[PDB]
Design an enzyme around this catalytic site. Structure first.
Site, mmCIF file in Angstrom:
data_model
loop_
_atom_site.group_PDB
_atom_site.id
_atom_site.type_symbol
_atom_site.label_atom_id
_atom_site.label_comp_id
_atom_site.label_asym_id
_atom_site.label_seq_id
_atom_site.Cartn_x
_atom_site.Cartn_y
_atom_site.Cartn_z
ATOM 1 N N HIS A 141 2.275 13.816 -100.391
ATOM 2 C CA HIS A 141 1.628 13.677 -101.687
ATOM 3 C C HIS A 141 0.235 14.281 -101.614
ATOM 4 O O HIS A 141 -0.197 14.739 -100.557
ATOM 5 C CB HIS A 141 1.502 12.201 -102.077
ATOM 6 C CG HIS A 141 2.801 11.479 -102.259
ATOM 7 N ND1 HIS A 141 3.621 11.670 -103.352
ATOM 8 C CD2 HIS A 141 3.380 10.501 -101.527
ATOM 9 C CE1 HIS A 141 4.646 10.840 -103.284
ATOM 10 N NE2 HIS A 141 4.523 10.116 -102.183
ATOM 11 N N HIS A 180 -7.932 16.688 -112.788
ATOM 12 C CA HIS A 180 -8.142 17.651 -113.844
ATOM 13 C C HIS A 180 -9.636 17.765 -114.105
ATOM 14 O O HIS A 180 -10.080 18.604 -114.882
ATOM 15 C CB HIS A 180 -7.440 17.223 -115.133
ATOM 16 C CG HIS A 180 -6.007 17.644 -115.218
ATOM 17 N ND1 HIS A 180 -5.256 17.484 -116.365
ATOM 18 C CD2 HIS A 180 -5.179 18.209 -114.304
ATOM 19 C CE1 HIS A 180 -4.029 17.926 -116.148
ATOM 20 N NE2 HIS A 180 -3.957 18.373 -114.904
ATOM 21 N N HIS A 199 -3.269 13.717 -111.079
ATOM 22 C CA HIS A 199 -1.875 13.487 -110.694
ATOM 23 C C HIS A 199 -1.510 14.198 -109.400
ATOM 24 O O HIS A 199 -2.184 15.109 -108.970
ATOM 25 C CB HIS A 199 -0.946 13.964 -111.817
ATOM 26 C CG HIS A 199 -1.102 15.415 -112.151
ATOM 27 N ND1 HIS A 199 -0.572 16.422 -111.375
ATOM 28 C CD2 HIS A 199 -1.743 16.026 -113.176
ATOM 29 C CE1 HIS A 199 -0.876 17.593 -111.903
ATOM 30 N NE2 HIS A 199 -1.586 17.382 -112.998
ATOM 31 N N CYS A 200 -0.415 13.761 -108.801
ATOM 32 C CA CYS A 200 0.129 14.320 -107.566
ATOM 33 C C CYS A 200 0.621 15.675 -107.951
ATOM 34 O O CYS A 200 0.964 15.884 -109.099
ATOM 35 C CB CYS A 200 1.334 13.490 -107.148
ATOM 36 S SG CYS A 200 1.939 13.638 -105.454
ATOM 37 N N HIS A 217 7.160 14.622 -109.075
ATOM 38 C CA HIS A 217 6.210 13.616 -108.668
ATOM 39 C C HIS A 217 5.436 13.074 -109.886
ATOM 40 O O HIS A 217 5.297 11.865 -110.067
ATOM 41 C CB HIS A 217 5.278 14.187 -107.577
ATOM 42 C CG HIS A 217 5.927 14.315 -106.227
ATOM 43 N ND1 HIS A 217 5.427 13.699 -105.095
ATOM 44 C CD2 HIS A 217 7.125 14.840 -105.861
ATOM 45 C CE1 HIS A 217 6.288 13.836 -104.098
ATOM 46 N NE2 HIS A 217 7.328 14.525 -104.534
ATOM 47 N N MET A 268 3.399 9.454 -110.685
ATOM 48 C CA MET A 268 2.197 9.740 -109.952
ATOM 49 C C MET A 268 1.038 10.314 -110.691
ATOM 50 O O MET A 268 0.695 11.484 -110.474
ATOM 51 C CB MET A 268 2.479 10.538 -108.707
ATOM 52 C CG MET A 268 3.064 9.721 -107.571
ATOM 53 S SD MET A 268 3.009 10.637 -106.008
ATOM 54 C CE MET A 268 1.651 9.970 -105.261
ATOM 55 N N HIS A 296 3.318 7.626 -132.656
ATOM 56 C CA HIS A 296 3.879 7.724 -134.009
ATOM 57 C C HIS A 296 5.098 8.596 -134.317
ATOM 58 O O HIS A 296 5.259 9.062 -135.445
ATOM 59 C CB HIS A 296 2.805 7.900 -135.106
ATOM 60 C CG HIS A 296 3.133 7.186 -136.389
ATOM 61 N ND1 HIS A 296 4.088 7.641 -137.275
ATOM 62 C CD2 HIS A 296 2.624 6.054 -136.932
ATOM 63 C CE1 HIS A 296 4.151 6.828 -138.311
ATOM 64 N NE2 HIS A 296 3.265 5.851 -138.128
#
Ligand SMILES: [Cu+2]
Ligand SMILES: [Cu+2]
Length: 330
Positions: free
Chosen positions: A85, A90, A125-126, A135, A140, A296
């Site tokens: 992993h 971001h 995230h992974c 993943h 993840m 929604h």
């Protein structure tokens, strides 16, 4: 050288613691883681797944721171586981962131460182190579835141614141189934892866858721717161886218894317875221118751788952518302 520281861681938803513103310165821271893967378951038924994541858871834791510162871481892976992993863131620058470095594987571880610167828330995230896615888716991832320183515121410136825161884451897833258807388961892881892837491719887823488962936241667981217060828531896724837313418521413131620177725116318603891335837213518451837361669409837421738741517590117113018436026729 510166210183360283460481831281721790825791788981868811828751955251751891721381412151826112411161013163312181730157430184470184540381852481560780671980991764884881496982398986688981887712748813218820049981278924488961396986897943992956870172620690353990888904888703892863866341861381825271512121712107410137650186861271460281370480991672681880273980051984046980297985895977791996890682982661881527971001935111840172280079390588891618770281992844490469881281890677780781298982066981291982590683560580790384770176620175832261830128612121716111863213886722982570992974991944691984081839794986991444797976993943991431698974788971993840867661866321861272840153714141510125110162613280926151628105547109214108012113310142624113727241218280618381828571865371848631867513895742888516894828797973596967078977044939028958158923778914497937496984054990281882691887086986588962293959288927787853285938578923994735386708784208668608299955488932878615937230943291882881478905338921877871628721018841217890668922867441828471118261018315017034414121717361823141943151857511884441890674991958895818878614847217866321818461328911018732627214846213216031825222841122968406877440870153822171620117412115835221216112118111627213628812836213867215884217896937990858884461864112844141714131627221516160018123018324118471328950518521628821867632896415929604528813368916896825418811158906697937895514858513858741837361628771617251316180018171118422018526015015615003118522028824017136118632228804128836016578
Ligand atoms: Cu991974
Ligand atoms: Cu990415």
């Amino acid at each position: 050288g510166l210183p360283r520281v460481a831281v721790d861681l825791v788981a868811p938803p828751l955251v751891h613691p721381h412151s826112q513103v411161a013163a312181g310165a730157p430184k470184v821271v540381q852481f560780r883681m671980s991764i884881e893967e496982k398986k688981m378951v887712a748813d218820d038924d049981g278924t488961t797944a396986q897943a992956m994541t870172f620690n353990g858871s888904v888703p892863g834791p866341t861381l825271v721171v512121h712107e410137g510162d650186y861271i460281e871481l370480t991672l681880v892976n273980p051984a046980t586981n297985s895977m791996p992993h890682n982661v881527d863131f971001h935111a840172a620058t280079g390588a891618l962131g770281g992844a490469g470095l881281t890677q780781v594987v298982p066981g291982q571880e590683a560580v790384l460182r770176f620175k832261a610167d830128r612121s716111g828330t863213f886722v982570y995230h992974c991944a691984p190579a081839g794986m991444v896615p797976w993943h991431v888716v698974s788971g993840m991832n867661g866321a861272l835141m840153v714141l510125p320183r110162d613280g926151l515121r628105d547109a214108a410136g012113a310142a624113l614141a727241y218280d618381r825161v828571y865371t848631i884451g867513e895742s888516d897833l894828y797973v596967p189934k078977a044939a028958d258807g158923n778914y497937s388961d496984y054990p281882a892881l691887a086986s588962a892866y293959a288927d787853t892837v285938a578923v994735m491719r386708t784208l668608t887823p299955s488932h878615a858721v937230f943291n882881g488962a478905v338921g877871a936241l628721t018841g217890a667981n668922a867441l828471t717161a118261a018315v017034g217060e414121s717361v823141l828531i943151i857511h884441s896724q890674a991958n895818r886218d878614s847217r866321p837313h818461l328911i018732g418521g627214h846213g216031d413131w825222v841122w968406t894317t877440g870153k822171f620177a620117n412115p835221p725116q216112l118111n627213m318603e628812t836213w867215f875221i884217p896937g990858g891335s884461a864112a844141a837213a714131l627221y516160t518451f018123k018324q118471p118751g328950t518521y628821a837361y867632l896415s929604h669409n528813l368916i896825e837421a418811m158906e697937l788952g895514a858513a858741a738741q837361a628771s617251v517590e316180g018171q118422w117113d018526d015015d615003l518302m118522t028824s017136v018436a118632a228804p128836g026729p016578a």
